């Protein structure tokens, strides 16, 4: 039996909030004109450090610890870029037209031009951020959506009881989301409508990850920007 299923909705919210990773900083070199190699270096360095904190946060997601090691590996291998992106989108909400990669690394779509094929991913990220802004996405909802991505993105790729537990945890997070919306005063119809709107954005986040993964793969055999072994192994699992 899993302890995560015994949690109430409030206890689930507080566990997810308490597990939030910290906001990291980028290099403080203020050389303003970015080159392709310099910008991708900053983002690669930042992303590799965020990955380490993502693993600590995953182990703190209710139900994640009750899975085997290989299932945890599979779920994170499949979702790591999605999870990075929804975090980037979230902390970019209060900065319309910009992406807050770090408090000291705030970029617009013009700066995406420094890297080939990056402006398309920026525009999608900016579009998701604006969509989160227009819905007044709340932090309690954000931590639910991010956990859903972790458990859901890889659960259909368990090829050859464990998946039954993940879906039971996913149902818990759903109950937690509805509980958050009823607590915010939304009617029954507004509740399921908002539930649907939030979950449909995950399909777009998945789309963005797939485009981002191809962009990272092409940078690998460009060999211009060196990639950490951890990123190479996360990247390698998508082929």
């Amino acid at each position: 039996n899993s302890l995560a299923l015994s949690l109430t909705a409030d206890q689930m919210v507080s566990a997810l909030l308490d597990a939030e990773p910290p906001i990291l900083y980028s290099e403080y070199d203020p050389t303003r004109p970015f080159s392709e190699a310099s910008m991708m270096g900053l983002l690669t360095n930042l992303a590799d450090r965020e990955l380490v904190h993502m693993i600590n946060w995953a182990k703190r997601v209710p139900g994640f610890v009750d899975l085997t090691l290989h299932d945890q590996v599979h779920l994170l291998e499949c979702a790591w870029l999605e999870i990075l992106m929804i975090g980037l989108v979230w902390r970019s909400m209060e900065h319309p037209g910009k992406l807050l990669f770090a408090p000291n690394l705030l970029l617009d779509r013009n700066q995406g031009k420094c890297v080939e094929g990056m402006v398309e991913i920026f525009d999608m990220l900016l579009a998701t951020s604006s969509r989160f802004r227009m819905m007044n996405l709340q932090g309690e909802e954000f931590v639910c959506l991010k956990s859903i991505i972790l458990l859901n993105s890889g659960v259909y790729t368990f090829l050859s009881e464990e998946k039954d537990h993940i879906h039971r945890v996913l149902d818990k997070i759903t109950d937690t989301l509805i509980h958050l919306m009823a607590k915010a005063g939304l009617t029954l119809q507004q509740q399921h409508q908002r539930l649907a709107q939030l979950l449909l954005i995950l399909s777009h986040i998945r789309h963005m990850s797939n485009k981002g993964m191809e962009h990272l793969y092409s940078m690998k055999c460009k060999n211009v920007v060196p990639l950490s072994d951890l990123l190479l192994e996360m990247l390698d699992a998508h082929r």
Binding site: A58, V73, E77, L230
Partner: peptide, 12 residues
């Protein structure tokens, strides 16, 4: 197989 991710999850 050897994976850095194996070590990070075990030392979390």
């Amino acid at each position: 197989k050897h994976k850095i991710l194996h070590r990070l999850l075990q030392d979390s």
